[PDB]
Symmetry: C3
């Protein structure tokens, strides 16, 4: 089965894409950036405040999709050229990919895309 | 089961790789660049035309594997720094309705120095 | 079923992460860098000795999960700025994505992520 996920607790995609799609038992979450869902405005803070907003958004999507943090299996982290993660990926310990790039959408510091599983 | 997807309407993969692979109900498409399968070279040189060729390439592979555009669930887009606006206009033609999960990031260099490269994952139950 | 994969033959996982997660018939392997599992230090040499090392680590994680190089269905290669590949992927002929980025972890020259399938 296939379902497009959408909750008001994570940034609202403005372009042609969804927050997350549940395909079978896998959940593919779109690249997340630091945007406060309630206000729709990008946080202009330090890497830790931005990274926390991102992880908060991902969690919102996981929850709306009916998953929990320990269902997360793979995380790709893109940074603009961290105990924060442990409270989120501690009981999960997903496989990780991390790279630095030129720029992210809306000149943000960090972007994260995730995949989760649930039997 | 595992299966290699090949089509004449998409650029031929160079080396020990494939255009796409169907594993179970998932279709993993290799990254595509704006190479016109008929001419064998990059198109015009403008973001719009390049984004179109890439999407056309992706469409062919999907079509070759018996999938459609609305089966695409995740797309990752790599750009070479800011033209990340026109890309969406062409992109909406192909994914405006099904709205796949997206990931967009800008990088250093892409294969053959193109301006855009896109990879996708499709799902068919 | 969800199972984290582990092998002493690959670089020890630092932080809240795994070398790989097995979900359903899929194996999601974390980004691998040219770290010599034995010494824990970056292997000496150029992009060729780093490539070898990376692919070797991937192979290690694969075998520890009961998978084969013929199982690799998708490969994502990050570079900073060859016959080895035919040896490791001439049998699986996976879908490929390759790009260049600003920098990799521990400022290495190459990072490779991968996905494998086994029915």
């Amino acid at each position: 089965m296939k379902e497009v996920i959408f909750t008001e607790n994570a940034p609202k995609p403005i372009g042609p894409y969804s927050q997350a799609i549940k395909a079978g038992n896998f959940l593919f979450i779109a690249g997340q950036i630091p945007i406060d869902p309630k206000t729709g405005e990008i946080v202009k803070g330090d890497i830790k405040d931005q990274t926390r907003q991102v992880l908060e958004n991902i969690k919102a999507i996981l929850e709306a999709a009916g998953y929990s943090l320990n269902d997360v299996i793979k995380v790709t982290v893109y940074l603009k050229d961290n105990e924060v993660y442990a409270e989120y990926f501690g009981e999960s310990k997903p496989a990780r990919v991390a790279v630095e790039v030129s720029r992210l959408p809306k000149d943000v510091l960090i972007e994260i895309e995730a995949i989760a599983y649930k039997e």
